[PDB]
Amino acid sequence: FWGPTGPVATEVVDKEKNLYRVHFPVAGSYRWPNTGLCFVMREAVTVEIEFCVWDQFLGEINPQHSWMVAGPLLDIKAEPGAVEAVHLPHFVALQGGHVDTSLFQMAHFKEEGMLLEKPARVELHHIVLENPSF
């Protein structure tokens, strides 16, 4: 990330499969500027990220056109427990009305199926989760 270290070049392994990686040495982080995705943790570790794509994941879910996608569906391959907040780039709606913060429900996929976990809190352009960020 472009956090307290400055510009860290994200390791791309292949353009075709949208897989990315970084090793980020300092505490916290700052938002990656492409969309505003950001994760903050405490210590120098490796993280791998994929941007999983909804088309083959929402065709498995039955009212597919009923829900509305608010962003990327990034998977994170990090070690368990060492990520302490994740910020997914939610589209802005709080500037308007009729969009509730007690309405939002979160998509965590499994081979088992969609889990609609309730998020922690929604920013103007982000959503944060707590320590189990699977």
Partner: protein, 138 residues
């Protein structure tokens, strides 16, 4: 596992939740004539990278234009116009914003422009109440 964003629209009323979207313009430099492609799309990096790979294959390059200043409704009908439109062939009348996967090409208006110069007015205009949401001199 994958982690994902909020996904909710209530059944009991259609709301048209506004989106942080932005359109994209692709130019040409080499060929005999010049064609813009206007991608009325949301503002996700995954959608931008899908468009980037496809346009890179098509030999198109994006120039950073003025983005919209306001949120604007998903799925609604947005007529595309231009001061250089009418003389130049904007391909469909009403374009669509509604969200599609990166794994396919996104919904676009073709725009054969002929000469490119340094600036031609473009328009997009709502069909609910004809209010301006965007303009850019290219």
């Amino acid at each position: 596992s994958p982690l994902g964003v909020l996904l909710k629209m209530i059944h009991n009323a259609l709301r048209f939740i506004p989106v942080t979207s932005v359109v994209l313009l692709y130019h040409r430099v080499h060929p005999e004539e010049v064609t813009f492609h206007l991608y009325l799309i949301p503002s996700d990096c995954s959608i931008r990278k899908a468009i980037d790979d496809l346009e890179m294959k098509f030999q198109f390059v994006r120039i950073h234009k003025p983005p919209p200043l306001t949120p604007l409704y998903m799925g609604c009908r947005y007529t595309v116009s231009g001061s250089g439109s009418g003389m130049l062939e904007i391909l469909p009348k009403e374009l669509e914003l509604c969200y599609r996967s990166p794994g396919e090409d996104q919904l676009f208006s073709e725009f054969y422009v002929g000469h490119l110069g340094s600036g031609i007015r473009l328009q997009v205009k709502d069909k609910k109440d004809e209010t301006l949401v965007w303009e850019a001199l290219v």
